[PDB]
Amino acid sequence: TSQVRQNYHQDSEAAINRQINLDLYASYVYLSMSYYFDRDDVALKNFAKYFLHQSHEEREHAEKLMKLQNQRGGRIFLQDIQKPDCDDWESGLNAMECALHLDKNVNQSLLELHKLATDKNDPHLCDFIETHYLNEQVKAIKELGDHVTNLRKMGAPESGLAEYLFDKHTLG
Amino acid sequence: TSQVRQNYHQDSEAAINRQINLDLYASYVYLSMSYYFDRDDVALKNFAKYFLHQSHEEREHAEKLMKLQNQRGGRIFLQDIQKPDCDDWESGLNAMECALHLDKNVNQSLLELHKLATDKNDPHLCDFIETHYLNEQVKAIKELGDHVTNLRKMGAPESGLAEYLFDKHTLG
Amino acid sequence: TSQVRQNYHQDSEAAINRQINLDLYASYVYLSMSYYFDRDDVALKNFAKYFLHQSHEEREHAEKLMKLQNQRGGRIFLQDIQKPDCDDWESGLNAMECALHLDKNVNQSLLELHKLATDKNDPHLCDFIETHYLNEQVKAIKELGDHVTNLRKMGAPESGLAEYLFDKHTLG
Amino acid sequence: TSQVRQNYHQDSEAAINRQINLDLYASYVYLSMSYYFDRDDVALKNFAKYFLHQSHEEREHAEKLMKLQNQRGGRIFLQDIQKPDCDDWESGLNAMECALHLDKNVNQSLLELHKLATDKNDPHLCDFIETHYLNEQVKAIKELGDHVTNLRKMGAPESGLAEYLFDKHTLG
Amino acid sequence: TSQVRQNYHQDSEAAINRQINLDLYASYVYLSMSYYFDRDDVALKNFAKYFLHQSHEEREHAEKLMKLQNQRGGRIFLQDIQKPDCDDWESGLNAMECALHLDKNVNQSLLELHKLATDKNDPHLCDFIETHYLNEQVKAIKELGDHVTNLRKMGAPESGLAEYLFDKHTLG
Amino acid sequence: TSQVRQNYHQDSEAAINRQINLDLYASYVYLSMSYYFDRDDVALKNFAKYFLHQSHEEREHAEKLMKLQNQRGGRIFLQDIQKPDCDDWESGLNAMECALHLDKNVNQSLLELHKLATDKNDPHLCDFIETHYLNEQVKAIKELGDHVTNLRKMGAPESGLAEYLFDKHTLG
Numbered sequence A, B, C, D, E, F: 001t002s003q004v005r006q007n008y009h010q011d012s013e014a015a016i017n018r019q020i021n022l023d024l025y026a027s028y029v030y031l032s033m034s035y036y037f038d039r040d041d042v043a044l045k046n047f048a049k050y051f052l053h054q055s056h057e058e059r060e061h062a063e064k065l066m067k068l069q070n071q072r073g074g075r076i077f078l079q080d081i082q083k084p085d086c087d088d089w090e091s092g093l094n095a096m097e098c099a100l101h102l103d104k105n106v107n108q109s110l111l112e113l114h115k116l117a118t119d120k121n122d123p124h125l126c127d128f129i130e131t132h133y134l135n136e137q138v139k140a141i142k143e144l145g146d147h148v149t150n151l152r153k154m155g156a157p158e159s160g161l162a163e164y165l166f167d168k169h170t171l172g
């Protein structure tokens, strides 16, 4: 038992390790999405930049959870980072829809982690999740919903004009 | 009778109280419109910002009339602020049409107030209305008419592309 | 169901709408109080400025809750904003006592909203209330209590000297 | 009953008074440790500076809890501040071990206070503890653990060279 | 015997330890007084600030004596810091009267310490006391006397107006 | 076939995808190493910072190869990123030895990729590898060798003093 460990349940430690993997996975999905939009036959530079930004953020989230694990005297155990479900993301709209679905999955995991912390009477962990993650997640989900709505209203994915203009006027 | 009161008719005092309520109502309508455009399934940020600006302006108008009432030795009596007629404003174009109709209603009230002031030989009140309100109202009505025209010509409300581009290029 | 909605109970959505109305009501009460102190037969300019500041803050609170409602995929429903209970607020002391009572009522509502969020296992909503509102409310209530105490000790409301000096030395 | 008091349980009020005493005690322990390292036959200036910093911080914590007690309408009751268990702290390593043990005791108290606040449905108090204290405490405990580890690995307490170099390279 | 110790009598060493405790006690009394004036039913912010300043100064005095003890090769022995005689300090005037009495008690102790140093032919200790403490103490006592006089002349403690205005015009 | 593709062999495209995976793996190994040194029972902050820097660099390498793949009209196919061989890295020295071995493995892969490019008469790819990667790799390997030598000469891993001082004087 770590000399620093206090009020830190085994289950919480395990759940933090799983959340580290999921954040890294989410980083990987966004990395794949980013370079899809970098292909010469897709060529939406600001969609590419947008997803690369999300990729780096998810990596930073994982790093912050790795720091938390050590702060509380838990031990980090890393797992393979699974390749994303798609190699080809179809269109700007489809990628935004996929991002939205991903972010709600990550959100569900965070909410389950918060519930566990509550159940184990770990107010430090509850506070960590609420402060660093919950509102960020809500904001990301709202932003992706907004983007999906605008793309649909503009006539995406069938209108390549719509995705081009959105890339310029919203993501640029 | 207030020690400051001079040449200030009872009817004028009453009409000022009614105009305070109407300006507050107009503030409320614009507040409702603003956050409609903030919904994830509408997602026109500059339409939202535009109407929030109008909301605050209408609130400032009411405050300035409350100051006038006290300046002249009248007594402010506040009434309930009625909820707007709609919860869902339909489209950018429809909201601009509704705004236009509202502003002409407020204008009619201001013009009736000015007529009353004229009828009661209250040149201070005539000057107050002419200086603070009449030209502002004419400008707002012209601007909203301009916006309605551009949205219609662009193909709104059926073209979600039209409302998107207008949001970016005129309201942004 | 909104594409963004997640872990957001119907009851929470409804309670947020009620809190929006109450914050707007509180804005209205403070607006009425402010211009009472602007009357020529009251003439306490810093009491007027103090309450106008509270009015605007309460309006900002409502706007922030309207943003939250949209962030979570809820739908804003606005209700009439009731006129305050008084047109004449009596004295600086009486207005401060009324403000204190109002702020504790708003606080009770916020605490009930937080309890609901807890009961519905909505840590994002718990965090929103705790972070934006609870400590602000506690501080406001403490400040109003302080002001009431000083006014009473100075000899208010019977001493117009007391309210004059307080206006200058505390609120100025 | 204080005019400001709301949702503030008697037990919470009492627990805050006890935490004020414990923070003051912790301040006192660190003050004693600091000047031990200031002795001519110990003479580790940065160990002295390190503990004096912790002493002042603990004093500030107590002051902030005294402010909270008044904010909520509780009444501060102060108790004697007990002298620390030791007059002679032995070595840098032993003092760091003692600091670590102290900080975990203070942490346990804070966690029990948070549990009480939760049990009494006092979200303002839960938020106060989580925001001002829990993460600070976790960070302090991690830092002290780090310091203990480095001192042990370097060969402390038997190596006066180890404590000298640590004083220079980590605490300086 | 410390390698640095020279011309430093056992009795002087003991008296320094007692003065350290008394300065810490005085710090504690002023801390209690400060937060009394922070209560919502007292609410004199500058009385609160004034006493908090005295609290910190007394703490600094103790720290400087702890440094002296080590400088001369004496050994610090800390004792419990007794809670102050009152939890409720009554009024601004009564607190200033209590402060005055406290400062004269601390002064008497300092003068007895100086007499001891003289009796033990310790000119370094005589100089330390004269330079760091005696004139500071005389100035504090004169200031508190001045404050008591002004509060009494203004009509304190019965005039809450007097204490309010003094808080603003002298302590602010 | 991509409209941009020219002189880009299928085998080269495949080898680039494998190198992307290996760079990401190397990023992951360094990430694991970094937070090992962040544990409270290891507590070498500059070893932690050093490996985190290498992690980010390897990620940037992968991103640059993903850009190259698109530049040449190849198609990125991502694979799982395998967890590192160790969860516990033992000591600073052992981690530096592991880093050295890893970097020579990555170097061997880069050299095989360069040989393939040469065999397929792809001077653009030869130039890309030589310019972005080969000299960087040689420098990293030399640096890690230097670090291993200094740690061994200082008495690592048995001397915790050696690893502490190296952390301060070389990595700090």
Ligand SMILES: [Zn+2]
Residues within 6 Å of the ligand: A057, A061, A136
């Ligand atoms: Zn983030």
Ligand SMILES: [Zn+2]
Residues within 6 Å of the ligand: A059, A060, A063, F056
């Ligand atoms: Zn990073």
Ligand SMILES: [Zn+2]
Residues within 6 Å of the ligand: A082, A083, F080
């Ligand atoms: Zn797999």
Ligand SMILES: [Zn+2]
Residues within 6 Å of the ligand: A123, A126, A127, A130, D130
């Ligand atoms: Zn929390």
Ligand SMILES: [Zn+2]
Residues within 6 Å of the ligand: A127, A130, A131, C127, C130, C131, D127, D130, D131
């Ligand atoms: Zn929080």
Ligand SMILES: [Zn+2]
Residues within 6 Å of the ligand: B057, B061, B136
């Ligand atoms: Zn205007």
Ligand SMILES: [Zn+2]
Residues within 6 Å of the ligand: B059, B060, B063, C056
């Ligand atoms: Zn205003």
Ligand SMILES: [Zn+2]
Residues within 6 Å of the ligand: B082, B083, C080
């Ligand atoms: Zn109605």
Ligand SMILES: [Zn+2]
Residues within 6 Å of the ligand: B123, B126, B127, B130
């Ligand atoms: Zn005119």
Ligand SMILES: [Zn+2]
Residues within 6 Å of the ligand: A169, B169
């Ligand atoms: Zn354009």
Ligand SMILES: [Zn+2]
Residues within 6 Å of the ligand: C057, C061, C136
């Ligand atoms: Zn606020």
Ligand SMILES: [Zn+2]
Residues within 6 Å of the ligand: B056, C059, C060, C063
């Ligand atoms: Zn606003």
Ligand SMILES: [Zn+2]
Residues within 6 Å of the ligand: B080, C082, C083
């Ligand atoms: Zn009504």
Ligand SMILES: [Zn+2]
Residues within 6 Å of the ligand: A130, C123, C126, C127, C130
């Ligand atoms: Zn919370």
Ligand SMILES: [Zn+2]
Residues within 6 Å of the ligand: D057, D061, D136
């Ligand atoms: Zn702190």
Ligand SMILES: [Zn+2]
Residues within 6 Å of the ligand: D059, D060, D063, E056
């Ligand atoms: Zn302080």
